[model samples]
Target chain A: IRQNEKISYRIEGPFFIIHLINPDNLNALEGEDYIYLGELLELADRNRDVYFTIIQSSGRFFSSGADFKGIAYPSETSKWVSNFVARNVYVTDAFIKHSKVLICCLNGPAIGLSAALVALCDIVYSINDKVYLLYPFANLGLITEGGTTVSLPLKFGTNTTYECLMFNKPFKYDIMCENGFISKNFNMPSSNAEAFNAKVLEELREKVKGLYLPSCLGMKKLLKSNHIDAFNKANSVEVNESLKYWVDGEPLKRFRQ
Target chain B: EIRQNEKISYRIEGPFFIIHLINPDNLNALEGEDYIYLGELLELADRNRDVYFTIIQSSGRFFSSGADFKGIAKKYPSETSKWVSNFVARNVYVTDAFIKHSKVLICCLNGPAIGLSAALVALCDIVYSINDKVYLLYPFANLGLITEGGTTVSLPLKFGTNTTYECLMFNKPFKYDIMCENGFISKNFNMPSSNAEAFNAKVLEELREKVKGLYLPSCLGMKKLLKSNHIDAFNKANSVEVNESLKYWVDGEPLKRFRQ
Candidate 1:
């Protein structure tokens, strides 16, 4: 087990857990976090003992998306904007292409890029009944990234995707589960949040352990292999579409802190 | 009756243009003429600007049992090749019409829908099933056929890959609740346990009155926006399936099923 300022990582038997640790800032992601998370996932993939990865957060909010305050600046070069897109594409690609089963446990709010990552996971479970998934890329003058364009419409129907992305609809956990956006939902009782969370994890651990590792791996491989073409096509266009927003400088200027 | 026969029926009630499959003896299984007739009715709906919506339904033993085996089976090698190509192409044409049509398409399932019939019902904008007794089955794997009506791409998009495999390869029947949960069907209706006919008619009347006030332009716009996202993948999957199924048909596997 190793600990970083932004995230903590450990392995419980075959399950690898990466917990976002920045609650004070709502688990806001930064360039450093992406780099670290990317490297950590690669390490987990290379390890023979790890068969699944659980991505969860230690705070109330899953993530408020990227730390846009530091990243989006009004400069002639606009290199930061470009870098953010590249970083997002890299991290998202790594997570999608990773060998192990990637499970995202949404404890609370997951917005923008973070919400998109939830769509890319093999399976997603939300423990927080209050959790609401929002993708406000249109509000921010950005096009979709992180394969959200491809996966969102596929998981939720096109009209639902339009409402989420274009109209900035915040999808409640129950509706999300009903719409097949989230694979499942678990209740975290206010009476004992810690104990309930632990029970959920233990249940997931036993479930994963019961399955043959190779069969689990094979199923994920086939799913990804079938969808990779559409995913890549969507990914390539997203970077360029996002760049168009930066060039206009309207969104960057309006949202500047 | 506006137009009624053993094979098919059609009528217009105010703004609702209704098409019914009337072939109960063969479970409303479509022959070659049925496809062309459906296409023609769709074209009528397109031209009649007053028609706000189109409802396709059937009152039969089943919604549809797919293609008419007699028409598709027992052709010679060259004839069989042409038959396979035409059958798949006609399906593609009609299904695409449903997807691209300006009017909102509604399909109501009174009973089980199998094979190409199931795929066609799935292509509609909104679907309502009479009860839990309704099911959808795609028997492509058993028939040695590839997918048609862009379902290979569309089904996976809605239900994920594993469930898609179960339906296409394993011949799993998707029950009403499961279909609604998977976004395959919009909603399911629970009619009275007894007196099915009166119950079905009541539901259809309610739906018809509701759709009478629906704004056609808005539905067309929303449908276009929703469908444009997946049109490329749908087109690609349709082409691949049609080409490959031609070869599989040449091998005569589907013919045996047809003979049975």
Candidate 2:
């Protein structure tokens, strides 16, 4: 809880693991403090040795998403808001366009902001927990940030993106993995989960380069080459439309159980 | 205002490669002078060496708002084939030419994108607009005619089912911001409603210089890559748009009233 401003750097022989530890409790789903977490990722991509960056949480859920509670409902602000919360949004957007590999180690319930990070990563390994994912954009009368409008549809289909946004359905961990949103999953208790995940991370360190080999490069290249513009274009369009709905257009529709 | 020779400005800066349609003043190219400007644009895009990507956007506020209604109405049913033939040739084939073209096309809506302008933009790789800049309407719903320009195919591709269905059927007026949310335009800039070209230029700057593109150099690469599904979609929709338009054209309530 005290390590809010710190970027914890620990080296495992060859890997440089950057752990996101912020003091002000991470309310990732919303807020204004986090800027250029996306910019930081750009820096990582430019540097080659930075190899693998493993994103995790210290206090609570990997992320609850944009501080929807905070943003959707504003609070009195001055020179102070939590830095940890803002980092989540910046990081997720940055990771998506990063040149190097990024991975998410979901030690806790990765909901909302955390869920998007897991989805945007080059590869993700999640420990099974009673985690739920949310996408109440259409229902909430807003569009998603972090390029989910584009990225989600590509990961899931357009039809699925529509269904997910329209319905704001929260998915279970296994189902999320099964839907191909998650790359790998494991069953374990949260107490020992960090250590077990560490072992898996070690293995990933060994395999990531080989995995991302020339084959991975070409596929990513193909996406950027053939689809990125169209995808980004679509994202911008959605964002513009989102502004109207979230700020003006329709009444926010809260999901009913 | 779009400099053709400026290195940074002219250098295929944005997603769309530029093609000239025709001089609006000119009349009759293959049939009549109706699509003279668009024809010029398409011809330039096809042959130009410097250009790699292309989307057809009109310089004026009206993007071919529709066939000259007065001209067509005057000719009427007595010269139905003559009037209809120009519409089919100009609108249908031009759209077909670009849709199947290997280059990536993105429509930039400088003003209210209407009629053919509206349909063509719907078909491009991406469509961009400024605040209050575009009002997409298929006026054909009220007329005794049907839609042309392979619009029926491209409309659904960009706007999806429920929205596209309403656009052509009920003739909905979709605002700029909503269009962006629905994935109709790639992005919408909240610029003043005035000086559309300037607004377009600003947004265009973001795309032209800042953004990187994938569809230009790999025309064949994209063609081979994108062909499978493209051909499938194109083949499926091409027939569908034509047949549906024809069906609506013949039995349309508007047409029945016009004739009566």
Candidate 3:
């Protein structure tokens, strides 16, 4: 039935939740999923009732990114691949321009493009211990995607970003927090994952119940003010470069799982 | 045991360069010459490749009550011009010494650090407070001086925009809680102790332990990486500040009322 082919999103209490539910597939995002998720975020952005959005998932593997189940093509490859890149770009562009704060409620390994998007999130609250963010583009003979070439350095400093992008280093939970890439993390509850998820939501709920929403949203807008232009440039440059790499067949041949 | 003690002095211990504001009688009110001495000690500390940390601490409740204008009364027209230009340059040298310091520079705020003293504390790589009573003040309240010591650039970089603005412009006393909450003070040595003497002893005991473990090359490399981007900004602000001190000296001599 392909029920898990796309991401599911809805409102819960005051939070807008986008749930990545395809664990058996490593929660890999297909091309169609990008446009749908982007649409959901677009709706949430316009909906003043939704103060912020929670981007979380349902598996130990947050995502593998870009649904790379297969990659082979001919003269049609450029148009097809460009369209796919364009979809991911639209979501990232939406994320960059998102006026409200975005919090990432992580549930396992954040790999490749997933990790890059989380880096753009306002705050990251995870209930997983010792998890790492891996951008394996260099390992796969492709350039990094999702505007990380600039954003990673902005978050992790010059030397560490160089190590991460060039050597394909996996920045662990503690390292990520050290560089302020992830704001907060917690150990998974012994009872169950659902219990922890509810706890995270409640914790967030009680946090801003007494606080002023306009100030929170305005401050977020101010914080994201300086980075929007740079981020747009990076998104354009990174995706276009990776599209050419895809055409060269470098990633398909050099990708070693 | 490397020694000099005319109000201010320095000693090396635990392989860390330690500057002591030991003039308890005057509450460590720094004279004009003390800035040169401070810059010299900092230069020595910065040059010593073996030293990985330089710490500034005081022996009293008042870390310093800003500059001692009385000491200047105790000493300007032609000399004030040469002296202020020279004095401003000395302050800049100390600041540059801080910025180019090859190793970590730390501040241990035993009590209220006021005026120019507070700005130097802000320049440090890390800061700790002895207790909640400790505060950092730049006296724009009544006894005023425009921002100095590259604080115009450095304070806003580490401290937030609003917080640093209030601190530098609006005569805000950056209390220990505000400093600690804002990540300005890395730790608070607020032990359940009887007296200031005992509390300070406990602080050094912990500070030494923390300082010894961080001499690794990787640790040093991180400081280098962080400091690399800020040095250019610091140098630019420091030069402009020193030049402006000439106007304050030659034209608007505000502290001329303090002469004995």
Candidate 4:
């Protein structure tokens, strides 16, 4: 029986698979509720046999976003109002600094916070049709989360970040890949789940060769050489104060009206 | 021998101080051999009354590139310390001359303008590139040492910290137009009308004007006018820049590249 517990995990031959199960149980995580993703990370880390983790979603969509009801809609006195950064750091560091390579398969649209999480993944594969990195947080008093602040700059320079935040536009999948934000895209066939599964398996199987030994070295080197730590340090400053601006700052308070 | 006796070209006339740098033939002491003559040059300029304003001009294409480490290889500490003090003293002396000299101190466009050449140009009150058409590159900090001749103070004043860092550490070409913008070089006169001659003529003409009419210290006056209220900020920035200068030199990619 398929488990639809908002998130699911299974070990498949030297690989750990996480599926963001989008079955109508609890609506998109909003308001102070932390999604089950954090606990899933601990579980995935515990599985010794899994050399790499492939995180993707099932059902019609990937994710709506971070529960705005949890982060933005909470009471002004709520500590969770400020813990947005700590929460994002936990998730991003989990994927980035892990011993095993984390591959995210975007079989469908990944929007807002969902897209931000995918960006932290080592390799991001997106399906061609109905794919968009949505940013509806601009509608509310929210900003993109999950290491997008650091990762997006590494992919598409400062000017692109200005365009994204200043204009608050949704990014198309191909455009994201072209700008080096995402690794690649996959055209999973419409009818044949078996063929698509084989292609995915084959693609990941090639990576299995490297994961057999010290894999963290490669990713760590990649991060350090690219000034990713410097970028991350700068981004941590952005995330800390950006939320405060969105929540309490007077100039931005007009958006609430 | 730089052949100081050569007939004065119409293009190059000034209180020209000839720095017959270490006599290029003596490759034995590659290091001090280069800058050793600077002491004599400074001494001569101090004595010569005809040298109304001395411009330190070097002959070689790449300017005098400071101490030659290969020449100093395995030398004793006492021997090295002597050279080091002389090096520091001469550089500071040149810097002081520019600071205190009443006559206009200008630098003629000389060679690639590397280490000491680059330092002295930045030290001068006014510098003019001989031709508006040449490369003036500076990369002293990239060479695993601090720049002397007050460059660590004067450069940031002219170029600002960011561009100054790029030039000093990255070995990036500081183009003619950029030098002018940064207030490094006042004017970029064409080659045949060398910057040296232009500067000398201007000083003479200014002196003539002072005798006949009212002639104010335009450059210094302009600087004072601009800085009357903002002197503290300017000094603080220079202090900050000098401190930040070595942070890049001691623990920077440029130094790492040199060691490699």
**How high is each candidate's TM-score?**
0.57, 0.46, 0.59, 0.45
lDDT for each residue of candidate 1 in B1-260, tens digit (9 for 90 to 100)? 12334587788877678888877778889976677677678778877877756778786558899888877752436945685556766776766666566666777787888887888776766666777788888888888787877788767766667888877888788777667667555446776433335545765677655444233343443344446567777777766766777777777788877577
TM-scores of chain B, in order? 0.88, 0.71, 0.86, 0.57
| Per-prediction interface RMSD in Å | 8.0, 14.8, 10.8, 21.8
> A180-222, model 3: which lDDT tens digit per residue?
6665676885235455567788888889888888888989888
Using lDDT as the measure, the top candidate is 1
Query: Please, what are the lDDT tens digits per residue for candidate 4 over residues B25-105?
Result: 321112443343443344456456544445444333333444444433324266335433544444444445444444334
Best to worst by TM-score, what's the order?
3, 1, 2, 4
Ranking by DockQ: 1, 3, 2, 4
- Candidate 4: deviation at residue B101, Å? 39
Candidate with top TM-score is: 3
Worst 10 residues of 3 chain B by lDDT: B213-222
Q: Which clashing pairs does model 3 show?
A: none
Candidate 4 clashes between residue pairs 3 or more apart in a chain or in different chains: A29-A67, A30-A67, A30-A70, A31-A69, A31-A70, A32-A70, B31-B68
- The model with the greater lDDT, 3 or 4, is 3
Q: Candidates 2 and 4: which is better by DockQ? A: 2
Question: For model 1 chain B, where is the 10-residue window of minimal lDDT?
Answer: B213-222
lDDT of 2 by residue, B1-260 (tens): 32232111223443445543332332111223434445445555656655555645444444345444444334446333543464544555666655565554556565565565566666565566665567777766666556655566656655566877776788776666556555455456766654555655675566454233222332332222333334456656655565555545444454454443
Residue A80 lDDT, candidate 1, scale 0-100: 40
> What is the C-alpha lDDT profile of model 3 across B1-260, one tens digit per residue?
33575787777775578887888667778876686677678788877767666778776677778778776555236865665655576777777777677666777777887877777887777776777888888764344346677787756665557888777667778887676545566557884322445655665676565443232333343345445455777889888877766666555354553342
* Stretches of candidate 3 exceeding 4 Å from the true structure: A1-103, A107-120, A125-257, B1-3, B74-80, B164-170, B191-197, B211-215, B257-260
- Supply the TM-score for candidate 1: 0.57
Over A146-257, each residue of candidate 4 has an lDDT whose tens digit, in order, gives: 5565565445432233234323545666457646555666676433333443467678778556453445645654654554564455345545644554445431343334
* Top-DockQ candidate index: 1
